[PDB]
Amino acid sequence: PSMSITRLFPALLECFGIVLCGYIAGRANVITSTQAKGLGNFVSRFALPALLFKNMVVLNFSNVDWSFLYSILIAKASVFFIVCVLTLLVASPDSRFSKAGLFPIFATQSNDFALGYPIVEALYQTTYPEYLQYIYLVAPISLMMLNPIGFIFCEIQKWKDTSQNKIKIVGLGLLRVLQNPIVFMVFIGIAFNFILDRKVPVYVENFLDGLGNSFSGSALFYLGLTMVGKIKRLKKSAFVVLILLITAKLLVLPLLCREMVELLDKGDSVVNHTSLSNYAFLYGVFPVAPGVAIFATQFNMEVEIITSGMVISTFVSAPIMYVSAWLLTFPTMDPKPLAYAIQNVSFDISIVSLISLIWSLAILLLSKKYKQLPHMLTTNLLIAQSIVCAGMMIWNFVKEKNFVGQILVFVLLYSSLYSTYLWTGLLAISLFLLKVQIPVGIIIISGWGIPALLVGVLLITGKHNGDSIDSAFFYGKEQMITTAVTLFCSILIAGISLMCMDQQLTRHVLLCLLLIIGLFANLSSCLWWLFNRLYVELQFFCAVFNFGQGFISFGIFGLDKHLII
Amino acid sequence: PSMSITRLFPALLECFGIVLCGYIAGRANVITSTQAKGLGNFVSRFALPALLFKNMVVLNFSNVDWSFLYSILIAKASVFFIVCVLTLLVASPDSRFSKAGLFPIFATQSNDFALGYPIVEALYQTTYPEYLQYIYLVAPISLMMLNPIGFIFCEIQKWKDTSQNKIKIVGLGLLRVLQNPIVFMVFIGIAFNFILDRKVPVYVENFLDGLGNSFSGSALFYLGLTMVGKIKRLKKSAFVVLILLITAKLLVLPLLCREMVELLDKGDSVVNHTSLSNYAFLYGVFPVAPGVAIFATQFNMEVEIITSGMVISTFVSAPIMYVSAWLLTFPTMDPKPLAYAIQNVSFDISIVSLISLIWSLAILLLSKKYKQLPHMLTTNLLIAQSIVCAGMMIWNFVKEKNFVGQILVFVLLYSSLYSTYLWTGLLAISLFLLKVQIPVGIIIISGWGIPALLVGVLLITGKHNGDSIDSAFFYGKEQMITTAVTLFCSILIAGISLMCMDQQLTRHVLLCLLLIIGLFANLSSCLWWLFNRLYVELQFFCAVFNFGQGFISFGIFGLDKHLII
Numbered sequence A, B: 001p002s003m004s005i006t007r008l009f010p011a012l013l014e015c016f017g018i019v020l021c022g023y024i025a026g027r028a029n030v031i032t033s034t035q036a037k038g039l040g041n042f043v044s045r046f047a048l049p050a051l052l053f054k055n056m057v058v059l060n061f062s063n064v065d066w067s068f069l070y071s072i073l074i075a076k077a078s079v080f081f082i083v084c085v086l087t088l089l090v091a092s093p094d095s096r097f098s099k100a101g102l103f104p105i106f107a108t109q110s111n112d113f114a115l116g117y118p119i120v121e122a123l124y125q126t127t128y129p130e131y132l133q134y135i136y137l138v139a140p141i142s143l144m145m146l147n148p149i150g151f152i153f154c155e156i157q158k159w160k161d162t163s164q165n166k167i168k169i170v171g172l173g174l175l176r177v178l179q180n181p182i183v184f185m186v187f188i189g190i191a192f193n194f195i196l197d198r199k200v201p202v203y204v205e206n207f208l209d210g211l212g213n214s215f216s217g218s219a220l221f222y223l224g225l226t227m228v229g230k231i232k233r234l235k236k237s238a239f240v241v242l243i244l245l246i247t248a249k250l251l252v253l254p255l256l257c258r259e260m261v262e263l264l265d266k267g268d269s270v271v272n273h274t275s276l277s278n279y280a281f282l283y284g285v286f287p288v289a290p291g292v293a294i295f296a297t298q299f300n301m302e303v304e305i306i307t308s309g310m311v312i313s314t315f316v317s318a319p320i321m322y323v324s325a326w327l328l329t330f331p332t333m334d335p336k337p338l339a340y341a342i343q344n345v346s347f348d349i350s351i352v353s354l355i356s357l358i359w360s361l362a363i364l365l366l367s368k369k370y371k372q373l374p375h376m377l378t379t380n381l382l383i384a385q386s387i388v389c390a391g392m393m394i395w396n397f398v399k400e401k402n403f404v405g406q407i408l409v410f411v412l413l414y415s416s417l418y419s420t421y422l423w424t425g426l427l428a429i430s431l432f433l434l435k436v437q438i439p440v441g442i443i444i445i446s447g448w449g450i451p452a453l454l455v456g457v458l459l460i461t462g463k464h465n466g467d468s469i470d471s472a473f474f475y476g477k478e479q480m481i482t483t484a485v486t487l488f489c490s491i492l493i494a495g496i497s498l499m500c501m502d503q504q505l506t507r508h509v510l511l512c513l514l515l516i517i518g519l520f521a522n523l524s525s526c527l528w529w530l531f532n533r534l535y536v537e538l539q540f541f542c543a544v545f546n547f548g549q550g551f552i553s554f555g556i557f558g559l560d561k562h563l564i565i
């Protein structure tokens, strides 16, 4: 296979684990915001310039697929042009030059070095070691091309706030690009590539190793530290804009990077073209660089949107990277190894979800929020999600073991999974009712007795498919019916409730909206399989939601500020 | 060879280059002392515990030479006991428990992880990869053994400043050891070694890699940052004590570590015993850990001595590591590859010295100190030292080229080298005269015409030995006579002047004292070779001084605070 896709989850755990470390450290005041600057200045002024310089010196320019680069740079210029033009059309005249400066940079500047590189190394170091080169090519050339334009727009905003001297405006944009270590150490590294015939001098090599190898962990930790307190409650428009920009960064850009490789890489080998198109997609899924938030702070422009969006982009990239890489690998796999891949995916996701759930439960418990409404109902949801994650980790082994194990593990897994769907409905209707002593005892048995009864209907009616690798087909058609019926109910309850619409109702709405979308995908898998490789893709998205929805619960209620005892 | 000794200078440039980066960054206020804490807390609470945990899990305890460990730990316990007892005998009663707490820790706690490990990796990774294990063994066990004793003495000092509750005093010592990440992540890592059958779980492995690999550069940079402003002018007694403690750390300890391996490693293989004895020596040359300065700050005891001493130990370790490793390699080398080794050494030292000289010159020039006395005479010294370093880098190639090159390069090299000796004398006598318009024009031609005349006496009288790899024998006996005569003069002038004893006279005295010792070694090489492998060792120490004395000039006047234009 072109991607060593099994190596990705370890690498994402490196990436987002060290981010989580930096985040916890900042949230705990292990490292204060002023202390974080020493890590940041180490990272940006020493560890990164050394990493760039070494990799630029080593780089074999006569063995670079320039068409891949052109493809990514054209995709970024396309996304930049779109977001810029739409901002100039859509935004208010008082701020459209700051927005059309920074929003296009947000949509195109990737976290290439801290997050992209360890992931690309994990995926490709053993199969396409040349793919690692293009991170050190794309990211700087991307800045050199696109950031002076965005900085010109911010300088126009600065002039408008004070466009008379055009060449001063252009020069201040270009100068702010030249003053970026990413740009000047790439110029210097290219020079020394040609001065040294690509050989790092042996005396300097280990110094550059020590600094460069300290970049990754140090930058990921600093990223975590700079994520602390940055999500601030945005107006509806600022939130819609942020969703659109993260979509530009994490959906529009990877789709164009893929398409541009397919237009402009005229190379012969289908496997190399495939893997390169896949790599282009993955390159697009990298989050927004923290540098963009730095530019926003330096210009004092769009700061909340850019900082929030960078943080959220980072969080959201983790599942999208994982999901995309597997989805891109699936058409190469044979049908059975694809089932095994989906159970692997499910196990991996079960672990992050389980841990994020155990944390979120501990917060809801120790904060005593679990006694308040709708937080009690939210706790029931997360218990169900936790049981789903444990049940999936158990199924990963019990899929080889006897029926007496499988039936129990399935009953666990699908009672609790159906419960997660039902609780999405029950939560949403409670938000309507709170927006009236809601009938908590009835709502609780509705979220727990009813799914146990529905699984009972499977033990009563269903055909036991113990040969199946995927528990989603363990009771066959009857399971798909039972699952669909559960989802049909919970989506109608949830949607009609949101239509009918501290207590945190807006965050519970956000939780329900995202969980609804996961229910809706699952409904689609059930109804698509009932009525009829796009199905197996959708089945994987269902697995991803089913075992990873605890991570959504964590992303909204795990990261709450309340603490106790 | 047992040490890949050619890899050491690259590794020392990694080590002390990243320290120099951290130092420059702090001195420039790129990173303020409060900002440095974020790097320090990353290093101590995340990067180091990950490094320790991974290496502890991986460690094959059934393949550890426990006798090596015992040897190092017995050497450290010996040095600890000596320094402790001598402090309890020699020190004043009001502070002897703080001194007998921290001085023995200073003499025994090595910078094992930030400096020792990359150096041991460089020397041994390809020949004795098992030698890397013992850093993760010795350093924690050393803390566990020895630091609670020193902390007990500091707690006795704390009680005396306020020994009634003995077990509280013992417990506070042990608790401060347990609260060290080095100790608890070693306990945890050993546990998980035995839980996981030495296999890091694959999901966790890359996370531990990212953090652990960020330790080295990050810790070396933080070390540099914490060296800023820490050398504060000590009383004569505090200075003598500091010299004695750095000698305990960097001479007494490596000699005992060597001897203890030779007493307690009863292993059969002479090459393995040799390399292990050499490794034990090198392990002893690691500087004082910054942790010791942290304990001093936490106890508020002996802070200046411990911090200054840790900084100076770090600086002084660099040459001692280099010099020792080569000296320990020399008895394995054949006589000719030993000559080539000495020219390699000379080249390496010429580079660090040359750069440190170019810096120190630029400071003395731009500060305009070069117009003041004795700083003018100090500038003449450093010009001569710079020419020596360039001349040696040229000789490294011209030793293969024709006599017309060699004679010119030698004339350069030995006029300027003799000038460095003469300038040591001329500087010292000027310190006496300043402690009287000193006859600067005469002193200048004395430092420059006289050595050119003496080299002329070589071009007049000497036999040209163009086959010689070492320029110290290029004009044979006549050169050794000329060199000796130069040294005999300059040592008598210098010594009689110091006996007869901003303007910085105390620092110029320190410069003269150290340069005198280098002259004295060189005199010994000349007179020993004139009158008669200990000679080749001494000849190497002469090369080391001759090409590295610029680094002494830098260590005293390069790191001055004055700046301009």
Ligand SMILES: *[C@@H]1O[C@H](CO)[C@@H](O)[C@H](O)[C@H]1NC(C)=O
Residues within 6 Å of the ligand: A269, A271, A272
């Ligand atoms: C894909 O590219 C690699 C690297 O140049 C090359 O070795 C390989 O043969 C290519 N594959 C095919 C089938 O052309």
Ligand SMILES: *[C@@H]1O[C@H](CO)[C@@H](O)[C@H](O)[C@H]1NC(C)=O
Residues within 6 Å of the ligand: B269, B271, B272
């Ligand atoms: C030295 O130790 C290594 C590691 O156990 C071993 O392989 C080697 O044979 C030893 N050398 C001799 C000569 O015993």
